[PDB]
Amino acid sequence: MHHHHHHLVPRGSVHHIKRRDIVLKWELGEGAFGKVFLAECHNLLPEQDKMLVAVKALKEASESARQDFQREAELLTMLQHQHIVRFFGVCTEGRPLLMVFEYMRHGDLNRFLRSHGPDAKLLAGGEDGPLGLGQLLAVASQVAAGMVYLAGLHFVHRDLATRNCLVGQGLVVKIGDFGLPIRWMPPESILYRKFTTESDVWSFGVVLWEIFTYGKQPWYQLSNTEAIDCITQGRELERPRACPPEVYAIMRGCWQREPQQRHSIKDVHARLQALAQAPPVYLD
Numbered sequence: 001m002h003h004h005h006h007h008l009v010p011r012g013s014v015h016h017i018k019r020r021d022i023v024l025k026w027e028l029g030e031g032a033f034g035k036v037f038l039a040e041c042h043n044l045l046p047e048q049d050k051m052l053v054a055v056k057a058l059k060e061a062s063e064s065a066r067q068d069f070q071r072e073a074e075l076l077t078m079l080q081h082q083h084i085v086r087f088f089g090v091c092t093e094g095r096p097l098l099m100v101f102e103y104m105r106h107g108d109l110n111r112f113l114r115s116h117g118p119d120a121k122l123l124a125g126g127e128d129g130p131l132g133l134g135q136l137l138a139v140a141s142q143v144a145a146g147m148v149y150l151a152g153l154h155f156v157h158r159d160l161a162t163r164n165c166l167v168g169q170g171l172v173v174k175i176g177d178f179g180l181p182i183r184w185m186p187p188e189s190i191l192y193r194k195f196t197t198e199s200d201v202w203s204f205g206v207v208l209w210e211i212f213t214y215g216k217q218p219w220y221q222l223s224n225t226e227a228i229d230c231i232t233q234g235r236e237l238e239r240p241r242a243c244p245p246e247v248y249a250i251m252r253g254c255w256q257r258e259p260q261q262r263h264s265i266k267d268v269h270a271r272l273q274a275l276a277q278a279p280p281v282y283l284d
């Protein structure tokens with residue numbers, strides 16, 4: 001499993017939550033493996049007597065999982081930043097074993113982008129304004145910030161996509177993981193299964209494309225095989241209509257064929273916070 005996070009050592013202890021303090025309300029979507037519930041958490045934070053959390057319940061017993069659960073929990077207690085989905089602690093009192101996370105009310109970034117995009121009405125007869133340049137750049141900057149954090153910990157995500165980012169209380173974007181993302185992968189990751197900080201910056205560039213297409217499928221016009229072919233052949237995703245050349249220049253910097261030629265996430269977030277600060281002059 002996380003043999004790729006073996007080098008990481010958490011200094012702090014895992015917080016244990018009592019069963020009683022967790023009051024499950026109803027499921028958050030269609031959780032795979034676990035299923036995720038929205039729950040009321042008692043005595044977790046002093047300021048908020050009964051706060052809202054996302055609770056992931058583990059499916060299987062056996063030291064195989066019980067051991068994995070403990071390592072996943074330990075690593076998560078270590079990952080604490082404004083742009084990383086917060087982990088609160090675990091519950092071991094009886095079965096199933098629970099993992100408690102911060103509630104992100106607007107769900108994943110992909111649906112969010114789709115629902116705040118030009119094709120929104122086409123994606124909903126369902127319920128029934130497109131996110132502006134600054135709004136898109138804020139999202140883009142928030143994600144890069146999470147990636148600058150993880151690179152600081154020598155942590156490789158391996159699955160950075162808008163589907164794995166979450167939106168919360170007032171357009172706050174945080175990187176998480178819902179658990180082969182070939183379309184977001186660089187050629188060294190496809191062919192040689194080599195995942196580094198450089199592999200993650202490429203995926204960030206794909207995330208940037210996803211943001212500026214309002215959740216469109218990377219290589220949508222291609223099958224999985226067709227996509228692998230174009231990635232290894234050196235083909236780059238076309239600059240979205242919504243994307244200014246200034247933002248496209250960053251994606252291209254992430255997609256540099258040679259990993260050691262790819263633009264650092266520090267430089268990427270820096271450039272993104274600067275454009276996010278003053279949106280560039282762009283007209284379609």
Ligand SMILES: Cn1cnc(-c2ccc(OC3CCN(C(=O)Cc4ccc(OC(F)(F)F)cc4)CC3)c(C(N)=O)c2)c1
Binds near residue numbers: 084085104166
């Ligand atoms: C409107 N709506 C419909 N569904 C939702 C919804 C569904 C599931 C949710 O919870 C799950 C998200 C996915 N998970 C995580 O992201 C854990 C993780 C953290 C860091 C992390 O580290 C790192 F580095 F990758 F970021 C890895 C995993 C599990 C928990 C939430 C929520 N967090 O409120 C919201 C909202």
